[PDB]
């Protein structure tokens, strides 16, 4: 498995990479959509353009891509 | 291989929390993108190229969850090693 | 022993057919948040409005998925 | 004749032309409202659904409310 | 060449007339239902929120008389 | 004479042909959103006043045929 191991460890680091990316997108998004809300809504000041809050989900997306660290084999086997 | 199998079995349960989560983020922007693109054109009926577009992801959202669910058949043979 | 890591291969697959989806999804949400930006302005015009570019991200997820293979 | 012919054509078209605008000024209300309600339900339920996007389609036909134009009169 | 263009022109049109006939009905239905939804919908709210307006009268009617005019633009033998 | 028409016509029929598919589709898919909630509505009650589906399959099974059945015109 020594070999079988690494595959696991490797087929792992990649994921967190994603996870990173994922919670990385939304970012700009919640922001963009959060400004166009504030600008569009702001035009009206001559009916109310709602807002979006998704922060909580995002930082809970990393704490995980940070957890998956330990699921990585230890390389004590033999 | 006491921690090994586990470690793996672990990886899943964390990952799976990501997918479920993620969706919600997405189903959370889908509403308000669709909500605002609806208050926009409303303010307008009050000029044509100014059409407020819609967004549907539900089926992209739905796919992630058999995916998060079915993983529950991957988990290694806990007590049978 | 075939049945040992069997789950494994089978596992990695699924996770893959997720970021695909995940990315297949964002581009869209990406495509409508931008439009409405265009539309708006064109109201004050005919007050900025940010744009966004998740592209490289929408890109790499797919790749980060071919690695798994 | 002839001038009665082709002209009875320059009719079939300007006729079509309106139906296409209409067949697309209602469509854009059968989404402009299926997306108004679809909403509320959710907006309610909270205290699943789904929106409608048919702009590719609705503009496509609207675009043909022009090109049939280089298909009218003649001499 | 021309002694057979009438036909083409001919049938060529009568069809379009029912496709658009078709379009007047169909579109018509989704006008009802959608309101037999804001209905169910709205009706729920009392037992603010409000499933709203949907009057696409115009269109179907218009699509109708356009349906009546084309036999007119039909070359006559 | 007509050789700058018998094609302006053969041309004419196209934009039209392809305005039917855009029609159907414009409802074939919108058809769904209406019977979608037409049930998310029910379930909002079921468990706890009527959701009528919608059925325009034929209307959407017409517009398409008047399309193929239009190749006899050249």
For D19, the closest chain F residue by CA position comes to F19
Mutate to test the interface with E, among F56, F64, F69, F74 (most CBs of E within 10 A): F56
User: Residues near F58 by Cβ (< 8 Å), separated by ≥ 6?
Assistant: none
**In chain A, which residues have their Cβ closer than 8 Å to the Cβ of C50?**
31-32, 35-36
Domain with D3, as residue range(s), is: 1-75
Is C19's Cβ below 8 Å from some Cβ in A?
yes
Q: Are D38 and D49 in contact (CB under 8 A)?
A: yes
* Nearest residue, CB atoms, E37 vs list F6, F38, F73: F38
> What is the distance in angstroms between the Cα of E38 and the nearest Cα belonging to chain D?
6
Alpha carbons E29 and E60: distance in angstroms, whole number: 10
Signed CA dihedral, E69, E73, E77, F5: sign only: negative
Entry resolution (Å): 2.8
For residue C55 the two structure tokens come to 């592209």
Between the CA atoms of E14, E15, E20 and E26, what dihedral angle is there, to the nearest 10 degrees? Answer: 130
Q: Are B8 and A47 in contact (CB under 8 A)?
A: no
Mutate to test the interface with B, among D28, D30, D32, D51 (most CBs of B within 10 A): D51
* Nearest residue, CB atoms, B18 vs list A49, A54, A61: A61
Signed CA dihedral, B18, B23, B24, B26: sign only: positive
Closest CA to A17 of D45, C66, B32, B76: C66
**In chain D, which residues have their Cβ closer than 8 Å to the Cβ of F38?**
none
Residues in chain A: 78
Q: Are E63 and D22 in contact (CB under 8 A)?
A: yes
Alpha carbons D1 and E77: distance in angstroms, whole number: 10
Q: Which residues of F12-42 are buried (b: 16+ CB within 10 A; e: fewer)?
A: bbebbbebbbbbbbbbbebbebbebbbebbe
- What CATH number has the domain bearing residue C63? 1.20.5.300
Q: Are F68 and F13 in contact (CB under 8 A)?
A: no
CB contact under 8 A, B67 and C17: yes
Burial class (CB within 10 angstroms; exposed 0-12, middle 13-18, buried 19+) of C17: middle
Q: Are F15 and D64 in contact (CB under 8 A)?
A: yes
For D35, the closest chain B residue by CA position comes to B54
**In chain C, which residues have their Cβ closer than 8 Å to the Cβ of B12?**
11
Q: Which residues of E3-28 are buried (b: 16+ CB within 10 A; e: fewer)?
A: eebeebbeebbebbbebbbbbbebbb
Alpha carbons A60 and A56: distance in angstroms, whole number: 6
Is residue E14 classed as helix, strand or coil in its secondary structure? helix
Alpha carbons E65 and F35: distance in angstroms, whole number: 30
Alpha carbons C30 and C28: distance in angstroms, whole number: 5
Q: Are D39 and F39 in contact (CB under 8 A)?
A: no
Looking at the 3D structure of chain F, how many domains does it have?
A: 1
Phi and psi angles of residue E3, each rounded to the nearest 5 degrees, phi first: -80, 35
């Amino acid at each position: 498995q020594k070999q079988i191991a690494n595959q696991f460890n490797k087929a792992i680091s990649q994921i967190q990479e994603s996870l990173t990316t994922t919670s990385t997108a939304l970012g700009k998004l919640q922001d963009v959509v959060n400004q166009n809300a504030q600008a569009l809504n702001t035009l009206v000041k001559q009916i109310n353009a709602s807002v979006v809050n998704i922060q909580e989900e995002i930082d809970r997306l990393n704490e995980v891509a940070k957890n998956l660290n330990e699921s990585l084999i230890d390389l004590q086997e033999l």
